[model samples]
Target chain A: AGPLSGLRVVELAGIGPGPHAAMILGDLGADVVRIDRPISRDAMLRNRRIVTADLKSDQGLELALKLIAKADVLIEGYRPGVTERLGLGPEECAKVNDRLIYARMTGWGQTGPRSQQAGHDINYISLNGILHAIGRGDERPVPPLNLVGDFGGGSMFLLVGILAALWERQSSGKGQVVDAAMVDGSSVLIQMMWAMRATGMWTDTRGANMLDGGAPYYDTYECADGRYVAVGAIEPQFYAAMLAGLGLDAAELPPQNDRARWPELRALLTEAFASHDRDHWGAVFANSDACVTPVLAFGEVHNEPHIIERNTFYEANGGWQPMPAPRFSRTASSQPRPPAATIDIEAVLTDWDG
Target chain B: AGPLSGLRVVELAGIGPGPHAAMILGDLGADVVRIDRPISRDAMLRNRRIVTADLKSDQGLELALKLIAKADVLIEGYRPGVTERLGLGPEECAKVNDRLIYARMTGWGQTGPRSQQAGHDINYISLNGILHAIGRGDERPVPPLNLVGDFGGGSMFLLVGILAALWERQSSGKGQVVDAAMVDGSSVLIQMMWAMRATGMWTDTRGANMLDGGAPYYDTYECADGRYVAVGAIEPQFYAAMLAGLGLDAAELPPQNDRARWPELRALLTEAFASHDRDHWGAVFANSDACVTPVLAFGEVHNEPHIIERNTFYEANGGWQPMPAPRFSRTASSQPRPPAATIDIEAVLTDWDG
Candidate 1:
């Protein structure tokens, strides 16, 4: 059992962030009952038991309300008014169960002009100023998919909001709606860049600022094997150590803060790094304070010695994945079981009838 | 004044997520005091006050601890053991004020093999499996520049953890350390991707997946002006609206889920989108269900009609910036005050001498 082991979450399945939120809640040991589609041909679905329900039918809506009466949280990610139109809106659900933490996720939000407009992670993040800061300076803005908006901004923020609301419910003995807007969360995720830009430490140009590939001391370098390693030796001493660790000639590098010489310095460092393979550089900087690491892919990450030691990845339903987050000491979280089946109206109603 | 109004947060300013977390608390109307190095002079020095405190000096360390005693929350972004070595660790500060919420942030964690090892946002997200799924097919992993790990995983998680601990403290009458690691948060952030991938709806290829730019229905397209607009009309109705609005020939464009034809269909859609400027397409699909939105830059976003109507951005000290997030009707938040001047030990102690 995890921190939220005793919590019961009613997840109205749709796509994208909604499912993602359910997964996080499940990962943290919440009992997630995914209200999946009434009919699905896919047979490989695991974790959640299949449930059949026609939400358009009044009986189905009433049964869902009964489930809401038994749940601690309810999450839905349909467009602005779809849930309300479906008769599972916050007001209706809260009326049934005032203690239910009703969470709604959308790209724009429930009340915006574009609230009903369709969007994916890219469009949402684009609207929030995230896509503008990515990619090469000369190229068009790169869409990092829905990672920024959908998952980070949308789903992650929804998780935080629900958890926070749950904490509030612990005291207030009541729950309210959590309107998690992807654009809003994505904008919040851009706080550092915004603060830096406001303070003039960050440039609007994609790769012309510290940590954005402008600073020679804090950028990526390619190895002879074509793999890259990221270096973030920002402090003066760390920069000196990084230069020494990388075996770069001291005289060739300019002062770390000299903007006028960053381009040349970057080019020089790039060339220097390109001379060696990523493995060779990784070995050279290994066990040092140069702040360098190889850019391992997803599959390769599990093989890293550091991750292996930390037990970061866990096994669930015969599949290997990440463990629950922010581990607790005295009351450590249990491993997440396989996902629950799609909410079955009869089974769920019978189970909560007690 | 908002929900968090009158709440004072002492931020031991360093870099990246620390300031970002402080910015969020500040944005939410908490009285945030960022303590920076008084002797350090940087070009971008507007948002935070530079408090002179040489932690190496006993008097300075005492002053820092005193500030912590008066703070409701404290955020620090130093490597594990660094703060403790300076005698400002959680154990030390919690002793001074048992009700303080102390947040510590890093890339790996407080207890991993790589916890003390140095890395940045990219490296952390790389290990967490987000970086591998981003970018175009077969390209070297593009660093989204600390966004995924630093702000998304680090700052946001720290902010939530601190707030949760704050809520908990109101009940338990005790404070605790919040070990917010970017690695942990990034993994949690990608909970949905893991679920999708686990369920066989996703693949390991970078852009071959639906949400990772592999699907034509969920990607960006270039316009006549070389500027681009994002379109994510994934559903059948939205997709139909997209084709009808853009006048794209179905015969040439192929069906939405035909993964085999995605590359060719994407090229065709790209050329079609390139036929008109983004503004023309915006007008074409304006007030429709095509789910199209113009790619906005940092400066251009302030003038967007949708954002304007929502008052998404606010002017602060002559600069347009984001507003407080997680909007609430009853407990609405206010924008943070302008950056303040650094207060000395005597002044801070006198002002907040609880």
Candidate 2:
């Protein structure tokens, strides 16, 4: 059993962030009862018992309400008014259980000019100024594969909102609604950047700031073998180690903080890295304070020496997958069960009732 | 008062993720007392009462322990064994406060092979296959400006671990150690990507998949004014709407999911998008399901119509800043207090005691 062994959650089957939030709750040991018409057999459904329910039908709605009444949290991803029209809005759910934490996950949010508009991960993040900050300066901004918007902004904030509400309920013993909008969450993620901009440490141009690819010392370089190695020697000592590993003389190289000399330095780095394969450079900086690392592809991540030693990934459902994260030392998390196809509703109901 | 109004937090102030985590706790109304060696006026220090403490000194150590005994959570971001050597590790803190949630934030982790090695955001995310999947296919991976590793992976997971541990303590009345590693958390952020790759919905090649800017309809385009607009018309209907908004004939266009025709279609979309300024297309797609959004820069984000309507950003410290997110329906969070330079420790202690 994990830390959340006794907590209960009811997930209204949805895509992206909603399922992801429920999966995290389940991974942390919450008893998640997923209500869906039929399970899609996705990894996000792991550790959850699936129950088929048609919300449009009275009987099905009643059953879902019964489960919600017994749960501590209910997660739903829908447009602004969809849930309210579904007879399972916060008002309706509050009537069933006064202590239920209602979490609404959406790209826009519950209230806004564009709240009712349809959007995907890209649109949400684009509006929040995140998409503009990524990618090469000369080219159009490239999406970070929806990670920033969908999960980082969406699911993670939903989790935070629900957990914070749960903590609040510990004293008030009253349920509350948590509106976790991707637009809001994504903006919050870039709060530090705003601070940096205010402090003159950041520029508005994409790929032209210290943390951005503007600094040659903090960028990825292609090796002779066509593979890549990332350099993040931001600190002075680490930069010195990186220069030593790269066989560059500090006297000849431009000063580390010279932004105007970055283009010249980057060209030099590109030529220097191309002289050796990725593994050769990896060995050169191994165990050093260079802050250099190989850019691992998905297939190679689990096999990386450090990753293997840490057991960072595990075999699940016949494929390599990451284990539950943010490890708890005292209450170890259980191995995640594979996504369930279906579950006997009666059994789940009986277990909850008891 | 916010949801976490009465909770107390002790932040062993470091950089990036550690302070960010404590800031979030403070944003949600936790009484956060930051223990640092002279406070730096960073945005992450907002909503916190700073108390300077040199951990090397016995007096400072005693003061920190007393504060830890009164706190519900303690967040620290240091290389492994640094805090333990400082006499403020989990073992020592637990001795003082058995119900203290000790959160350790780091790039690698507590027990990993590279845990003690020097690494930054790019290095941490690079090892986990995230950096490789980003950027254009022809070029080396570009850093996502540490958002994925530092905030998304590091601070976000630290917050989750601490919150989950706090929730667990409600029943068990016992605190635990939360080892929030950036490498682990970044990989977890891409859990769905692993699922996609397993099912052949994703490719290992950078920027060569649907969500990775490979699809013409799901990427950014440069407008005539040299600004950008992100397009995420992934679904068939949305794609059709986008095509219509761009005045492209759907009948003459290639099938939406045709990977082979993507380059040609992208060329056409780019040419079309370049015919007008970003604002022109913004109006063309306004109130439509085209999923097209103007890529607003940092300065322009707060003034964007929808964002302004949502009151998403507010003026702070003579600059535009994002508001605290994942809004709650009840016990709404108050305006964040500005970052402090240094605070009177005695005053904070007295206020808490009162």
Candidate 3:
């Protein structure tokens, strides 16, 4: 049993972040019975038992309600009123299980004008400053993959809300709806940048600030091997270490903060990195505090020395997946149960708390 | 008071995710007394009371120990053994408060060889596959503005750990150490990507897949006004809507999933978007399920119709900041106490729960 042992979570599984949230819950040791709409078995659905439920039918609705009545948590992802129309909304669920933490995930908020409108992660993040803040200075915005919006903003925030509600119910002894909107969550992810924007330390222009690849000392440069090394020597001592590792003299180069001289500095640093392969620079800076490391490729990530030492990534389902994170000591999470192929609803009913 | 109302948290302040985690605790109604090493007040330091404590000094260590002795949670971000050397390690604190959630945040984690090494967000994420998964196919990886490793993986994971521990302690009636490392957490953030890689649905090459700006329908386009619009029309219906909004005939264009013809499709979509300003495209897609939306610039984010109506961003500290998220209906969080400029350790002791 993990930290969340004995917690019963019922997930009305949908695509993207909904199943992801359920997976994390399961990883933390909740008994998550995911009710799929013929659940496509993907990585995100791992560690959960699954049952199919077509909400269009009366039997499906009854099954969902029966499960919800006993579940400590319920996760659903649909357009604003889809679940309400299916008679599984907060009002209906509250009648049977007033103690259930009803978690609803959406791109737009439950009450927003665009709640019913369809959107993807890119569209959700674009409206916030998160998308606009990325990319090269000369280039238009780049999507930082769906990592930031879908999981970073969506799934993580959903987990936070669920756990927070769990804590609140300890005192209130009742459940409430947790509306976790992607737009809202992703905006909070960029709030620190907004703070830097206020102090004039950060510019709105993409790739024109310290952390956004504007600084010559905080960017990735291609090596002779076509691989790259990430540099993040923002502090003075680390910047000196970077210069020393590059074999460039601090006396010869312009001051690190000279904004007008950044292009030339970047060019010089670029030339230095091009002279060696990524591993060469990695070895050269191995003993220094240059804050430099290789920009690992996808396949190469599973076998990194430090990653292996820490058990960060593990072999699962005949391939690789990340280990459960933010480890707990006493009630630590064990290995997650691999995703099941199929399951029975009548069997699940016997074991459920109700 | 928020969900964490009456809960006491003491933080050993450092940079990056440490203060950010403390800020979130404050946002959620925890009475967080940050023991700054004389605090540097920034946006992340908001919504919390502050106190200066020099851990190297005897009195300062006493202040931290006393606070930890009574605190429900203790957050620290020093390198490994730094707290142990200060006589405030897990064992020391356990003796004082057996029911404390001792939360430790770091980049490389406490048990790794790189734990004692200095690093930044760029370096931490580079080691994970996250940095490699971003950027164009032809280019080297780009730094994602510290969102992925720093706050997304680092801060959010630490918060989750703390909250989960809070839930765990409710029944255990005891506390334990939670080690939340950036490297561990950032790797977990990219678990879904690893899944795709396993299935070969995602390629190792950065931008050659569906979500990583690979599919023409799921990329950003430059508009005539020198602005950008994001398109994420992944599904069949949405793809047709995108083509319709762009005024391109579906019969004339290549199939949505035609990988070999994606470059040509991208070029055609590019040409279509370039014919009008971003606002024009936004208007054209307004009534469609195209999943297209304008990439709102930073200044424009505060006033977006959906953003404004939802109150995602609110004016704070004479500027704008994101509101507390994953809203709860009952025992709801009130407005956070705006960061005060100065505070006293003596006054905090008089008020904090023991």
lDDT of each: 0.72, 0.88, 0.85
Query: How far off is model 1, as Cα RMSD?
Result: 3.7
Question: Candidate 2 lDDT, tens digit per residue, B122-185?
Answer: 9998998999999999898988888899988889889989999999999889999999999988
What ranges in model 3 sit over 4 Å off?
A: A38-41, B39-41
State the lDDT of candidate 3 residue by residue for A1-354, as single tens digits: 678888899999788888888888888888999887753336767788898888889999998899999899999998889888999999999999999999999988898778878899999999987888888878777888888888888988899999988988998899899988999888878778877777777778887889888899998999999999999998999999999989999999989999999998999999999999999997998867899999988788777788889888778765788888889988888876677777888788888844
What C-alpha lDDT does candidate 3 achieve relative to the native structure?
0.85
Candidate 3: residue A177 lDDT (0-100): 91
Worst 10 residues of 1 chain A by lDDT: A39-48
Alpha carbon deviation, residue B345, candidate 3 (Å): 0.9
Rank order (by DockQ, best first):
2, 3, 1
In the order shown, the chain A TM-scores of the predictions are 0.92, 0.98, 0.97
Interface RMSD of 1: 3.3
lDDT of 3 by residue, B1-354 (tens): 667787888988788888888877787788888887653336767777888888889998888888888898899899889999999999999998999999999999998767777889999999987888788778878888888887889888998989988888889899899999998888878788878777777777887888888888888899999999999999999988888888899899888899999988888999999999999997888657889999997888887888999888777665688887778887666665567776888788877644
Residue A349: error of model 1 in Å?
Answer: 6.2
Off by over 4 Å in 2: A38-41, B38-40
DockQ of each: 0.39, 0.82, 0.77
Error of 2 at A173 (Å): 0.4
Alpha-carbon deviation at A123 in model 2, angstroms: 0.6
Q: Is the docking of candidate 1 incorrect, acceptable, medium or high quality?
A: acceptable
